[PDB]
């Protein structure tokens, strides 16, 4: 009640000043309120009296443009500023030259904060409540915010004061300054060290970006260049050949007989996602992922050494929810993962529904059309449909994973934002990746010979794939998710404030930096996720197609700048923190390279169908088996196809058929044979080479691991001379 | 010169009193010495008289037993101890209900060495050449050492000491008392932590061996009962059916055919160790290694909380050899390299010398002989000569290591250490490793069909194996080497003490403890490569037979009582020091985890010859491809064998020949055949079936590791909870 706040002086002499109406003392927060009312301005004016007594100094301004609304610029004194930074341990290289400026105003701002976090408001209804963010909770106060240097755009009146936020804007955040390179120093000076941290990891993650892009469009062009001399990709479409193969039809009942004729384009656009240099790739890719994470983590700890970001912590207090709320914590954890299946089993549902209407599209299509094929149309309205339903179905449980924590009990802001992003991580990943994962792996490996079909359902046989394999329409739906979500997210963020830009064409400090959208909570949560998809997007699946990385990379870049101007011109100025690495986005991370290698391998042999041409290259084409007397190629397309007598195990084809042998693309014995349909000896030749194949790169993919994590210093050499010198400077 | 140290009272009023001649204050240092001459006289007083001008307190006493020999007890005043303890920053809970008793002797004798090390001598020759350990490696300084409380046999004259060393010998250290438990904590508080985390970690081991043994023995037992059921080892030696098989010979000229008869007793014996106990074993093994290291690593946090081990280190003063001698730094590693390589290819060389004998003795034991095959008996002498070789080669190596590493520049000596441990073990890992390696991955895998065998010098053929497979002789080897190594050990040393003790039936402390050998400077390394290599043995080969654990256990169990006696009745005692874990052995045993796992995969698939039983079971008893109406093992012997109809790609076979088809142990076509001698097709799906169960074994292995890791919590919640209680009291 007693020891209220100077009343509002606003003088507003200036629209940036910086300081007090003496203009001597820096403002260090701004809290704006606008005057059941009664009792919480009672409430408020001893939140106020409390502050003034713990040493801040306050003095509130009327705004001008609204009356009801004032603002309380609140500064701390040094006395109170040391004794609470040797409080929170922040420590210093000293350089007393200004007290003023011996502080950047973002450690004043952070310790500030901290004050009012740790005091109380005099409330007895609860035995101690206290904290400012209760406030701002509770609505008694409009704001809390911290207040930028100046306009982005306008250089600041003083002169004394750097134009921080202008400097960034104009060297670092302007939508046409791409050539420049980012100034973290800068960046963490201003904005915290979280922000700086996470800007520093983009940034090494778009250098890594570039380099596997590099490799990759290397690799692509070896690729392309060598379409001329593929061989069996002319053989699928030579008409006295790949005319006369007859092969059976996929369906059951409606889809006629068709030849290899009609699959030339798709084989001669195969012919260069397949080839040998995709397999070096994905060797490559293992090899810079496993060198990436240790290479990010060495320059995590050069980062941790520079900013000094393992500073003492606080005891992080509770969340407002939690202890205004507080084995029923055991149930609730029960709750939530039944929840969280519960969506991940409706993302299966998705993709079986996609699976279904792939099937009756591709029905469809044969009748309609007498170019594309049928399987490629198929296959990209497939695939379309399935980013649209991504979409959607991502925007829907965002909101449903915020409504789920809340019935979960998070202790802390740390424990809400690790389990949200367990759970949010989790999904997207189940989403995206098995809508990929059906097509790469379970596509039309179980499907049996089409004398007896399998049924999965009893309705529909589960869909075999062309002979050239699954490959090109996995790198379909790869290309169409990561096109769809890149071209959205990067037209949005950049041409919608481009637009705005062009239907352009006194005010104080505080109130100008009002009219600003606060960060929110979580912060750069959503960019963290969005990165680490596209991330397992490259890692992946980077064998499916090279130019993976190149057009990430591209996105990429922008998507460094579009932050930038995000977090200059679009947002409130946010408390600085401390922050590790990333958080739990690194284990996850981590997890994401485990699983990658081991995904490249079955990529390249179960789903890329190279195995079998180097299998019928190296042994069957030999007089032991082939009638070639050297190794070759050739004929491979006519002695892997199998054959099929006309008899059905019903004989759904008879309807539609014109003649007696149907060649399937499976490797078993021909109709007349001690064992009919049985596997051939060629299959398991396969089979032994893929396991050995996928036996051989994994454990040469660890071990190359095993040994750059060995052999590379984890610190570098200059980080441990600086240490030494720091620490010897430290001893004297 | 001057400050003499008061000249030996030599009074030896008591043979045990732990004080000076006043009886007032500890002895905290013994330093004897006896007395060109002179001038190490003067630079010994010089020594002397620093010491003493320091604040260390000092006195000398003369030799009962020689005169020339002169001890000098060392003691420390509070002051001085207290500010070198503040200097070296070892914390306490205080009590100082006596200033002596608040200070452990321990940590009196340890802060004394500190102090010991970090005073100067007083020698301008060179410039500021320091330390304690340089006079006793001088020789002017006979010896420097910390004192026992009292005989280990008998109690201690003072009631106010408590009798520690008898205390230890009559509880934990009796080569009779074995039902006793460690009590780690008076192994911490006395001869300081290392040895203590060693004890610990020993202890641990012997746990986890413990378990591991009864599982095994389980497994064992199950193999063993079940050798009844067991169907092709009834076959291969019933006369009608295996004594009408007639299989080629395995060496070139001299070997006759051989039925395989003569092959029962082994065929019975290998049926208790390849049976599914054995792969139940196997993998078993797999997640106790994968959940034991994550369990000491557990119990190595709790230590360290326990014990606070990471108490911050000095400097870590550099080697007196290092400083006395100081990119020639890289070409001396270079030379180290060149000659460990040197080394590890003379034990590759002993491997195949090792070879070349099994051949010879082989082709000598066919003639010789008419119980035991001569296959056996060549294996259990090719055994028995390995076993002796490595004993000598590592008695060489240990001596051309320590040589080496003098070669080499070590910095400080836990550089010295480092190296020592990396070469050692190295060394060591290669030879043991790699003689059991050969028999069990590339003993008979790469051997073509007797038409065509393959010459691998021109001379020899490699050597096949029997149908069972190389499983017997892997587990012989690893058996033979195991027990011998055991055995010598122990053997030496428990009876040849225990012999000495039966061969039996004043003087002060000083002296007393001075006819003791000094423990040496790498301390416990021995003992720790030694168990690492059991551990290794206990591990990489586990699959090959299940009583690996058990016999270790046996041993382990003597070996820990034997340190602690030898550490108490026999080595003066050592200064205390403060150890983290291990140092590298925990790197060591991680990484052989690692390899284990998939080198247990690997036995179980490519040596133990079961796959091909479970696939000729659940496929090759079939209509499809055998006559059997349901599945069943019987007929494998003969179904499985190939033939040979006698051509010899010469004819070396027709010398001792009798007949015409001959069947050799593979799986390729009969002779009379479009694909004459090829692999059958029966031999593809059996390598998928083993590729495959590597994948899924390796998978699922690695899979339940990372699900452990992240699951059990890293620190127990009880060490969470001492910790938050003592930081709550001490911030109040």
């Given at each position: 009640?007693?020891?209220?706040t100077?009343?509002?002086?606003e003088?507003?002499?200036?629209?940036?000043?910086?300081?007090?109406?003496?203009?001597?003392?820096?403002?260090?927060?701004?809290?704006?309120?606008?005057?059941?009312?009664?009792?919480?301005?009672?409430?408020?004016q001893?939140?106020?009296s409390?502050?003034?007594?713990?040493?801040?100094?306050?003095?509130?301004?009327?705004?001008?443009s609204?009356?009801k609304?004032?603002?309380?610029?609140?500064?701390?004194?040094?006395?109170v500023?040391?004794?609470?930074?040797?409080?929170?341990?922040?420590?210093?290289?000293?350089?007393?030259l200004?007290r003023?400026?011996?502080?950047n105003?973002?450690?004043r701002?952070?310790?500030?904060?901290?004050?009012?976090?740790?005091?109380?408001?005099?409330?007895?209804?609860?035995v101690?409540?206290?904290?400012?963010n209760?406030?701002?909770?509770?609505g008694?106060?409009?704001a809390?915010?911290?207040?930028?240097?100046?306009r982005?755009n306008?250089?600041?009146?003083?002169?004394?004061?750097?134009?921080?936020?202008?400097?960034?804007?104009?060297?670092?955040?302007?939508?046409?300054?791409?050539?420049?390179?980012?100034p973290?120093?800068?960046?963490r000076?201003?904005?915290?060290?979280?922000?700086?941290?996470?800007?520093?990891?983009?940034?090494?993650?778009?250098q890594?970006?570039?380099?596997?892009?590099?490799?990759?469009?290397?690799?692509?062009?070896?690729?392309?260049?060598?379409?001329?001399?593929?061989?069996?990709?002319?053989?699928?479409c030579?008409?006295?050949?790949?005319?006369?193969?007859?092969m059976?039809?996929?369906?059951?009942?409606?889809?006629?007989?068709?030849?290899?004729?009609?699959?030339c384009?798709?084989?001669?656009?195969?012919?260069?996602?397949?080839?040998?240099?995709?397999?070096?790739?994905?060797?490559?890719?293992?090899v810079?992922?496993?060198?990436?994470?240790?290479?990010?983590?060495?320059?995590?700890?050069?980062?941790?050494?520079?900013?000094?970001?393992?500073?003492?912590?606080?005891?992080?207090?509770?969340?407002?929810?939690?202890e205004?709320?507080?084995?029923?914590?055991c149930?609730?954890?029960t709750?939530?993962?039944?929840?969280?299946?519960?969506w991940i089993?409706?993302?299966?549902?998705?993709?079986?529904?996609?699976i279904?209407?792939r099937?009756?599209?591709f029905?469809?299509?044969?009748?309609?059309l007498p170019?594309?094929?049928?399987?490629?149309?198929?296959?990209?309205?497939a695939?379309?449909?399935?980013h649209?339903?991504?979409?959607?179905?991502?925007?829907?449980?965002?909101?449903?994973?915020?409504?789920?924590?809340?019935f979960?009990?998070?202790?802390?802001?740390t424990?809400?934002?690790?389990?949200?992003?367990?759970?949010?991580?989790?999904?997207?990943?189940?989403?995206?990746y098995?809508?990929?994962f059906?097509?790469?792996?379970?596509?039309g490996?179980?499907?049996?010979?089409?004398?007896?079909?399998?049924?999965?359902?009893?309705?529909?046989?589960?869909?075999?794939?062309?002979?050239?394999?699954?490959?090109?329409?996995?790198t379909?739906?790869?290309?169409?998710?990561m096109?769809?979500?890149?071209?959205?997210?990067?037209?949005?963020?950049?041409l919608?404030?481009?637009?705005?830009?062009?239907?352009?064409?006194?005010?104080?400090?505080?109130?100008?930096?009002?009219?600003?959208?606060?960060?929110?909570?979580?912060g750069?949560?959503?960019?963290?996720?969005?990165?680490?998809?596209?991330?397992?997007?490259?890692?992946?699946?980077?064998a499916?197609?090279?130019?993976?990385?190149?057009?990430?990379?591209?996105?990429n870049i922008l998507?460094?700048?579009?932050?930038?101007?995000?977090?200059?011109?679009?947002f409130?100025?946010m408390?600085?923190?401390?922050?590790?690495?990333?958080?739990?986005?690194?284990?996850?991370?981590?997890g994401?390279?485990?699983?990658?290698?081991?995904?490249?391998?079955?990529?390249?042999?179960?789903?890329?169908?190279?195995?079998?041409?180097?299998?019928?290259?190296?042994?069957?084409s030999?007089?032991?088996?082939?009638d070639?007397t050297?190794?070759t190629?050739?004929?491979?397309?006519?002695?892997?196809?199998?054959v099929?007598?006309?008899?059905?195990?019903?004989?759904?084809?008879i309807?539609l058929?014109?003649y007696?042998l149907?060649?399937?693309?499976?490797?078993?014995?021909?109709?007349?044979?001690?064992?009919?349909?049985?596997?051939?000896?060629?299959?398991?030749?396969?089979?032994?080479?893929?396991?050995?194949?996928?036996?051989?790169?994994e454990?040469?993919?660890?071990?190359?691991k095993?040994?750059?994590?060995?052999?590379?210093?984890?610190?570098?050499?200059?980080?441990?001379?600086?240490?030494?010198?720091?620490?010897?400077?430290?001893?004297?």
């Amino acid at each position: 009640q007693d020891f209220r706040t100077p009343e509002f002086e606003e003088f507003n002499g200036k629209p940036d000043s910086l300081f007090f109406t003496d203009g001597q003392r820096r403002i260090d927060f701004i809290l704006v309120y606008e005057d059941t009312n009664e009792k919480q301005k009672r409430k408020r004016q001893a939140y106020e009296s409390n502050l003034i007594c713990h040493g801040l100094q306050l003095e509130a301004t009327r705004s001008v443009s609204d009356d009801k609304l004032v603002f309380v610029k609140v500064h701390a004194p040094w006395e109170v500023l040391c004794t609470y930074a040797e409080i929170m341990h922040i420590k210093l290289p000293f350089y007393i030259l200004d007290r003023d400026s011996f502080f950047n105003p973002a450690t004043r701002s952070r310790i500030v904060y901290f004050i009012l976090s740790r005091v109380k408001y005099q409330v007895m209804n609860n035995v101690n409540k206290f904290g400012i963010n209760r406030l701002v909770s509770s609505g008694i106060y409009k704001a809390a915010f911290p207040l930028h240097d100046c306009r982005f755009n306008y250089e600041s009146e003083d002169i004394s004061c750097p134009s921080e936020r202008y400097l960034l804007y104009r060297e670092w955040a302007h939508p046409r300054s791409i050539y420049k390179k980012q100034p973290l120093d800068l960046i963490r000076k201003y904005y915290g060290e979280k922000i700086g941290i996470y800007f520093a990891w983009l940034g090494y993650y778009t250098q890594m970006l570039l380099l596997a892009a590099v490799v990759g469009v290397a690799c692509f062009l070896y690729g392309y260049l060598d379409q001329d001399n593929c061989t069996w990709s002319k053989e699928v479409c030579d008409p006295d050949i790949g005319g006369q193969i007859l092969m059976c039809p996929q369906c059951d009942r409606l889809c006629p007989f068709w030849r290899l004729n009609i699959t030339c384009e798709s084989s001669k656009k195969l012919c260069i996602f397949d080839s040998f240099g995709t397999l070096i790739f994905a060797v490559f890719m293992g090899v810079w992922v496993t060198l990436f994470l240790e290479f990010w983590k060495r320059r995590q700890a050069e980062l941790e050494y520079e900013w000094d970001t393992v500073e003492l912590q606080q005891e992080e207090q509770a969340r407002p929810e939690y202890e205004a709320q507080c084995c029923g914590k055991c149930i609730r954890v029960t709750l939530c993962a039944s929840a969280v299946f519960f969506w991940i089993l409706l993302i299966i549902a998705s993709v079986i529904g996609i699976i279904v209407y792939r099937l009756s599209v591709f029905i469809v299509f044969s009748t309609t059309l007498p170019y594309l094929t049928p399987q490629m149309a198929t296959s990209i309205t497939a695939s379309i449909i399935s980013h649209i339903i991504i979409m959607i179905l991502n925007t829907i449980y965002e909101k449903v994973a915020i409504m789920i924590t809340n019935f979960e009990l998070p202790r802390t802001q740390t424990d809400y934002e690790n389990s949200l992003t367990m759970k949010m991580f989790l999904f997207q990943f189940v989403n995206y990746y098995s809508s990929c994962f059906y097509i790469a792996f379970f596509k039309g490996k179980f499907v049996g010979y089409p004398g007896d079909p399998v049924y999965l359902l009893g309705k529909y046989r589960s869909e075999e794939c062309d002979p050239g394999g699954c490959l090109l329409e996995l790198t379909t739906q790869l290309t169409i998710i990561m096109g769809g979500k890149a071209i959205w997210n990067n037209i949005q963020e950049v041409l919608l404030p481009w637009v705005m830009n062009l239907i352009g064409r006194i005010t104080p400090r505080w109130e100008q930096d009002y009219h600003l959208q606060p960060m929110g909570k979580l912060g750069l949560f959503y960019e963290y996720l969005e990165m680490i998809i596209q991330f397992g997007f490259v890692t992946l699946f980077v064998a499916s197609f090279p130019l993976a990385p190149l057009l990430a990379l591209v996105n990429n870049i922008l998507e460094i700048r579009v932050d930038a101007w995000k977090l200059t011109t679009q947002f409130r100025r946010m408390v600085p923190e401390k922050a590790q690495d990333i958080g739990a986005w690194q284990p996850i991370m981590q997890g994401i390279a485990i699983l990658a290698v081991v995904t490249n391998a079955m990529i390249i042999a179960f789903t890329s169908d190279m195995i079998p041409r180097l299998v019928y290259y190296w042994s069957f084409s030999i007089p032991p088996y082939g009638d070639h007397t050297y190794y070759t190629m050739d004929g491979y397309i006519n002695n892997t196809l199998s054959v099929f007598n006309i008899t059905d195990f019903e004989n759904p084809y008879i309807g539609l058929g014109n003649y007696t042998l149907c060649r399937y693309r499976d490797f078993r014995n021909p109709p007349g044979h001690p064992q009919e349909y049985k596997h051939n000896i060629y299959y398991w030749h396969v089979i032994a080479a893929k396991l050995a194949f996928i036996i051989v790169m994994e454990h040469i993919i660890y071990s190359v691991k095993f040994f750059i994590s060995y052999a590379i210093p984890d610190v570098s050499k200059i980080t441990k001379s600086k240490i030494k010198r720091e620490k010897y400077l430290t001893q004297k």
